[PDB]
Design an enzyme around this catalytic site. Structure first.
Site, PDB file in Angstrom:
ATOM      1  N   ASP A   8       0.855  -1.187   0.000  1.00 11.69           N
ATOM      2  CA  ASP A   8       0.000   0.000   0.000  1.00 11.69           C
ATOM      3  C   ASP A   8       0.891   1.236   0.000  1.00 11.69           C
ATOM      4  O   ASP A   8       0.701   2.154   0.806  1.00 11.69           O
ATOM      5  CB  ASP A   8      -0.950   0.003   1.207  1.00 11.69           C
ATOM      6  N   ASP A  13       6.896   1.563   2.544  1.00 15.93           N
ATOM      7  CA  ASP A  13       6.810   0.569   1.487  1.00 15.93           C
ATOM      8  C   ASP A  13       7.769   0.892   0.361  1.00 15.93           C
ATOM      9  O   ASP A  13       8.401  -0.008  -0.202  1.00 15.93           O
ATOM     10  CB  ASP A  13       5.404   0.491   0.923  1.00 15.93           C
TER      11      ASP A  13
END
Ligand SMILES: N=C(N)c1ncn([C@@H]2O[C@H](CO)[C@@H](O)[C@H]2O)n1
Ligand SMILES: N=C(N)c1ncn([C@@H]2O[C@H](CO)[C@@H](O)[C@H]2O)n1
Ligand SMILES: N=C(N)c1ncn([C@@H]2O[C@H](CO)[C@@H](O)[C@H]2O)n1
Ligand SMILES: [Ca+2]
Ligand SMILES: [Ca+2]
Ligand SMILES: [Ca+2]
Ligand SMILES: [Ca+2]
Lengths: 304, 303, 301, 304
Positions: A8, A13
């Site tokens: 996400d 990330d």
């Protein structure tokens, strides 16, 4: 080694993806995008941005779901900013470039990857709505995946959203427990938010998020800036740690406890990682090799 | 009237398919399989069994999911038999053919049929797992469907009686909920299990499920045996009525109530469902033409 | 009437047991536990729960085995909920106190039992893994038992399907050991078909729903899941056996004498070969439906 | 090495016991007897005989079960006689004395042995009814056994008493399949009946079961006369080879295949060997060192 990542993509990330890109040993085969830190629409764009700055603008990207399995969608999280990743500018990086995206739902894609990729590992840095639906559609495909390296669930209590829960699994407790009762927990490794706070670095004692010399370093610092403040001036590597452990294995493990997990989808504690010790369950990491995490993070940002 | 059925093909699901096969104003565009009463594999087998007892093999059949979304699977071999279809022998029906199956997931294929197939309808006799998962993957696709006919619930509204247990929605309440919150309840008609139980017959007093004259009579007669003897010697149309209203339109309904269904995904009652008299809700049917329904039961069992 | 009980404690078992706690002509001597409806430990917990809600756990609870004899332990049973007893909140019953469990194996204690407890009867409400293994180790002791009352079997002969039968298909080798060792003549049998034929319609019958005390609460709140799972019907599988075992022929309207064997191969492994036989089992076909519900109600005072 | 013997005392059972006794390095901690070649009454009597003939009877003897698990006793042609061991006269051995048996049931003694004493080994020369019931009643304790040596099966086509299976396993294939599916096949070694025909001796050319002198020779000779006649005049020494392997390690084994084994519990083939090349499966010995087998057979009967 051959790895598929579902993300996400917020700040951390993107940083984790850089970790797996920096290592030549690691073959990234797909990237899959779920809504969470940022909207699916933005998470696709953010992963484009990172593959652009690193220069490996070749891996495929798939748009998964834009919602949880059952639970209603909540208000767009500003935890990672408007664009969902420190709100960076695309002229301040040269990332003002047409993006890339396939035609298959990330569910359809990941099922294909599981049917066709010998020795495929998955790296799940997000709410797991994708993998859960993927398990429910073609379970005999998914269970071929060589291993699961997942980020989520704060089992020691203290978390990020609720009093004692965790963002990714609270986002779809159903998605998580689908995973935990469908994929064999012995073949999964779990990075909890508690391991992210336990290794939380002081902001003014560490500098690897404030360098220059190449666009990788510029990225790292300007993306990590706005969240460093949200954790009260500390580095809570939730996804970078899930990734570091996934790709290095036993020189990342210090003491990880074998545990069976479950989610609580009834009551006021809807989103609590609850855990019971078993040797045939998940290996959830509780401590890290911190000096080597620093020393690889500093590697990828060099220009040599 | 084009139409796509999803089924946990046990005994009533079977007869309900035969209802839609007898009337040449319907075009079954495809059939989709979900592990429900029986294992998924058996549901696909039984779908073949009824298509063969009809002799119309050119309908495509699609595998789905094997369990409900989060709930345990909970097959009922004490009510439907082991095979799912009353434990009938296939050398008694010339149904020992290899099984037609498609190489696509019912979820992709329903998403595709929603996109490419104008004025399509859906009749769901099973847990709504496949439909939920397709609504999560491609809702823009499934919301092209002009109408949903679903079998589930245990409504009260103006009447005051709720019995005990429904199967289809107590099995995947998550799936029912996804559906009830993502599809426009105003485009939905609902044959409750309470409609079934209130439209019982004492199998002694009527005869529609013990008649011998063709191959479809022998099919229905020996399929229905076990669940009839398990429901109290009583024939309680739960699936057949779904199909009976889903093709016969407003010409098969007696008293229809409009309530806003709301599945309970928590608390003591996780299998029950709440509802309130809402104009923009589903079309919950309370009463139906029992005298006209038994006639189609007889009139499909001809030579 | 002294009576040892073997159970894989599910919801039916529990109230079959309460049938026995409420009878002052019955003296339960032990409970032996088997992995059937739930894993063994859940079974120990729910026997402790049942005894507690009844209020006298001075009856030792012995552990048996967690798998059938040879059949692959498969097919996780969550029919009876996760805890085997309908998922009852222990705070509602104050029964989240520690468990009573004896140190002997249920098989050996079974054997010591029949070796010392005279005119001892047996009530088997579960797969017969325990009972059969005792039959192999020490038959000369177990045959001292004066009667066997077993739940299980689905004599296919009506339209009830034998695939709802569970006890015998769960470990069919166990059943064969018994029916080819212990006297078919000194054996009464409540079948699964017997238990469905005596099903009540829930909506019309009320005896499994009351909250005047802690056992009324226990009964109602445990049978909810099995009724909803059973299609809104009360199928007293276990309880009927205990009815017959406690109340003798006064509980029987109809019964055949059938020699019985277990299929153990082929297509229908856990099925019942049955033949009319003077020296056969007393397979019950019909009971007194009234005095049943009377006793069910009476045990809730 | 500390070893538990499970035996259905026929002739070769007894001489295998003699093997486990001739070695000053293999301690016998229990003998659990069980219906097989002869009834339980016999096997207790006849174990007693072997003990007395050898001189060390301090070994505790327990009685197992009187039957198989599910199968019956079927058709026994007294391959071992009426007493089940050549019908010797105890007055030729001075064995008309009382017999020793303990109070515990061989399964309870079995499990207790496995629960307490360390590095214990099992050598089974009979139907596995005792071990099957002991595994069911207490798998966690029998799983403490370091190694299993079992004589049973005929992974090659034909048999001994069955056109397809072998006596010790055909007799109770349920118990067989129990131990094959409940004890780790990798910690198991198998002496097949086909290993006893291949490794057989033309009694017309070999003499080690024809010697007079001490009682050990008297016993071996006079027990083995009948069953050598029944087996076409050959010497197919199944249990002596099993004990050869268990006591004398790998220099007993020249060739072996590791195969996963399974019991036909159905059909015409009821009781039949089933195998498959599997690295972590079982260890079916194919070709034994026939030379040292006879050496230690002569070392036992030595006058010393
Ligand atoms: N630094 C924070 N407070 C924070 N906020 C959101 N996250 C995301 O939550 C999961 C772990 O909780 C990770 O996947 C992260 O993307 N992390
Ligand atoms: N009413 C039900 N839901 C039901 N169905 C099967 N069982 C179990 O089967 C045995 C009878 O054979 C019982 O004693 C129980 O253990 N219970
Ligand atoms: N039929 C035969 N030639 C024969 N002779 C001996 N036996 C017994 O059967 C097993 C052989 O596998 C052994 O353990 C012995 O006890 N059988
Ligand atoms: Ca994340
Ligand atoms: Ca149905
Ligand atoms: Ca039971
Ligand atoms: Ca032997």
């Amino acid at each position: 080694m051959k790895l598929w990542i579902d993300t996400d993509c917020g700040i951390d990330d993107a940083t984790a993806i850089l970790i797996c890109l920096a290592n030549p040993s690691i073959e990234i085969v797909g990237i899959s995008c779920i809504g969470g830190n940022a909207s699916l629409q933005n998470v696709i764009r953010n992963v484009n941005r990172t593959l652009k700055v690193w220069g490996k603008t070749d891996i495929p990207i798939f748009g998964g779901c834009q919602a949880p399995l059952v639970q209603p969608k909540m208000e767009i999280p500003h935890i990672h900013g408007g664009d969902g990743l420190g709100d960076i500018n695309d002229n301040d990086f040269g990332t003002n470039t047409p993006n890339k995206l396939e035609k298959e739902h990330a569910v359809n894609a990941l099922i294909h990857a599981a049917n066709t990729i010998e020795d495929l590992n998955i790296l799940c840095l997000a709410p797991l709505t994708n993998i859960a639906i993927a398990l429910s559609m073609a379970p005999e495909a998914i269970l071929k995946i060589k291993h699961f390296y997942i980020m989520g669930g704060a089992e020691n209590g203290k978390g990020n959203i609720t009093p004692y829960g965790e963002f990714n699994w609270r986002a779809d407790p159903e998605a998580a427990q689908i995973v935990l009762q469908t994929y064999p927990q012995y073949q999964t490794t779990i990075a909890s938010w508690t391991l992210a706070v336990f290794n939380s670095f002081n902001a003014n004692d560490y500098d690897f998020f404030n360098l220059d010399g190449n666009l990788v370093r510029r990225f790292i610092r300007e993306t990590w800036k706005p969240i460093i403040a949200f954790d009260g001036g500390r580095i809570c590597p939730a996804d970078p740690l899930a990734a570091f452990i996934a790709v290095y294995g036993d020189r990342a493990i210090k003491r990880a406890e074998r545990l069976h997990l479950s989610m609580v989808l009834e009551g006021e504690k809807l989103g609590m990682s609850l855990a019971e010790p078993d040797e045939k369950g998940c290996l959830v990491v509780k401590e890290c090799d911190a000096e080597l995490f620093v020393k690889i993070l500093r590697e990828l940002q060099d220009h040599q």
